[PDB]
Symmetry: C11
Subunit: 89 residues, 11 copies
């Protein structure tokens, strides 16, 4: 095998892998949406607690965001800092 | 392998990868719909809090939108700013 | 590889990619249905709040529609404004 | 590659893509069913609001139907107005 | 490529595409079951509203059935009125 | 290509397609289970309404069964009345 | 193609198809579990209605079992009464 | 094709098929967990009905277990009583 | 085909099959977490029923664990007691 | 086939298999998050039961963690103690 | 097979495997979002228990984070400490 062929299938597999990793984004979208719903329900019934409601929503949502970020990082490594091309040959 | 062949499989893999990434869009759809439902339930029962209900719904939904945007960005990079073609040869 | 072969696998991959992106449509379907259910429950309870109920339902649903639209746009780019065929050769 | 071979894999890919896009139909099925359940619960407890209940159910369901329609349109384009065969050669 | 080979892979891809489209049937199954459950709960508590309960259940369920039908139609087109075989050659 | 080869890949694709279509069976299982749960909860509270509860459960479940039947029909067509083998040659 | 090769790929495809069909088993598992939960909750509050609770649970669960059985039947046909081997040559 | 090659792909497909069938195990896991949760909630509130609660939980869970068992049986047939190897020739 | 080639694809397929079977682990994770949540809610309200709450949680969870174990067993058979290698030639 | 080729496809299949097994991680994430939500709701309402709430949350979550661990173990066996390479030849 | 070819398919398989493992991220996103929702609802109703609410939310979420981390670790091993390349030859 020549080097152009080797890079070609390793990068092609990286494109597939990166796209697949992003499927994780489903999670934070569902979970954070739920938290948003509860915040909406709570500010209506407790206008006074708006400060706590929104800061608590944002903290909890930030935690729920993390695996979305992990997948994004894995995809950006595969696209822009690919660790396989350097191991070839 | 010649350069046309190399670009061909790297770009083909990119098309698949980009479409696969967009599957993440399921998430924000579900979550934001839920938040919308709670907003509807809350403005009915408390017309007096319409301002807070809608601003809270939009803030929380915007957070839930983020992984949908990440996947969109990954797909648009693969289609219009593909980082693999330049690494070839 | 000749140019006809190159276009053939890039476009074939684009057909698969476009179909795959549309899977995101599951999300808005679920979420918006939920918002619709809450709107139904609310207009039964408070017929006078019908204006706010329906305008709030539509606003929240529109937000939940966005990732469905993103996938539609990605699929239409792949079918009718394909960015790969021009990069070939 | 000859033209018959090129059309063959582009169309075969289109058949797979079209079937895959239809997976989105899961969404509206779930969401609209939920809305239906809420309408059933509401007309039982408020026979008087039947008109508003059913018109609100239909409006909200119609919105939830849209990504099902998008996938149907993408599938019908791939089967009956295929945009790839004309780009070949 | 000869015509028998071309028809063979286009039809094989159509078989896969048709089966894949039918995955959408999950949706109406879930949603309509939910509507059924609410109808059961409502006739028990409101025997007097049985007429409205059942007519409303059927209307709402019919709407939720549609994407199941779309997928069935796409599958039957691929099996019995295949649009690709005629484009070959 | 000879005729035995053509039948072989068309039928193999049909086996995969048929199995894939049956995935829809998830739907009715979930939805009808829910309706069953509501029927159980309702006969316990209101033993008198047992007739209406069970007839309403069966009607609603039957509707939810339909996409499971559609998939079964598509799979049985592919196995026992395959429409592709006759189109070959 | 010789007959041994033809049987080999048709049966291999059948093995994959049969395993894939069994994925439907997810559905009845979820739905029937739910019905079981409601039966547990109901016999605790209303020990008297135990007879109706359990007979209603079993009836509704049996209905929810059906698509599980359909997939099982499709898989057993593919394994023990395979309809493709006889169509070959 | 020689007999060793034929057995090789039929068995390889069987390994994939068996693994795929086990995906059904998701279902009973979800459903039975739900039933367990309801049993916990019920014995806390009704220590007196512990006998009925646990016997009802086990009966209902057993029913929900069945499609998990079906998939297990299909996988064990493919691994230890494979019906395809004997049909080869 | 030589024996090394035959073992290679049968074992490779076994690796894929074993990984696929483990997907079932999703189920017990969801269901048992639910039971855990109900146990938490119940010991808070009813500290005196702690004994029954925890023993009931563990029994019900153990049942929900079973399909997780089945998949583990299938995966360990494929890795450490593979039944296909011995059937080859 | 030479030994390098045999190890190559067996290990490549192992990488795919290991990645696939990790999909089970979805389950514990969902379930344990639910248990966490109930613990939060319970300590707010019953600060005095904090000890029991947290110990019960951890016990129940640990049980829900198990299939996540099983998949991790299968993946680490495939990566670091691969049982297939030794069976080759 | 030469060493460049062996490394190429083992690494390509590793890219796919790593992306697939990240699909687990869905789980913690859903579950932690739910816990966040409950924390929002609880601080609104009970501002004085803010300390316990947030510390309990973070503890429970951390537990739910673990399988997200496991998948991340498996993906980073495959990308930056790949255990297969060293086993080759
Ligand atoms: C998932 C990896 C895709 C790589 C395909 C390479 C095909 C090259 C054929 O010569
Ligand atoms: C899924 C990755 C698509 C790569 C297609 C490459 C096919 C080239 C065959 O010559
Ligand atoms: C998965 C993307 C489609 C792959 C197209 C390859 C067809 C060309 C085979 O020579
Ligand atoms: C996923 C679309 C399949 C396209 C495969 C075409 C293969 C042609 C074989 O000559
Ligand atoms: C789903 C598409 C199947 C295509 C099978 C092509 C077989 C090529 C054999 O020459
Ligand atoms: C995925 C659909 C089955 C493809 C059957 C192709 C078998 C032909 C190999 O020569
Ligand atoms: C799902 C497709 C299984 C059929 C594989 C055919 C293998 C033949 C290789 O020559
Ligand atoms: C799904 C299992 C298919 C096994 C394909 C065997 C390929 C052998 C190539 O000569
Ligand atoms: C599903 C397991 C794939 C097995 C691939 C065998 C390919 C051997 C190449 O000579
Ligand atoms: C999914 C299993 C990966 C097997 C890849 C083996 C490729 C060998 C072709 O030269
Ligand atoms: C998913 C693993 C992809 C297989 C990489 C090897 C195929 C390209 C070399 O022919
Ligand atoms: Na997180
Ligand atoms: Na987000
Ligand atoms: Na959106
Ligand atoms: Na919509
Ligand atoms: Na519809
Ligand atoms: Na139906
Ligand atoms: Na059924
Ligand atoms: Na069952
Ligand atoms: Na079980
Ligand atoms: Na467990
Ligand atoms: Na965890």
């Amino acid at each position: 095998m020549d080097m152009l062929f080797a890079k070609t299938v390793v990068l092609a597999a990286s494109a597939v892998g990166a796209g697949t990793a992003m499927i994780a984004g489903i999670g934070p979208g569902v979970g954070q949406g739920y938290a948003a719903g509860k915040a909406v329900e709570s500010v209506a019934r407790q206008p006074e607690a708006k400060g706590d409601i929104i800061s608590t929503m944002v903290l909890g949502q930030a935690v729920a965001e993390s695996t979305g970020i992990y997948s994004l990082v894995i995809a950006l490594i595969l696209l822009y800092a690919n660790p396989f091309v350097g191991l070839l040959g």
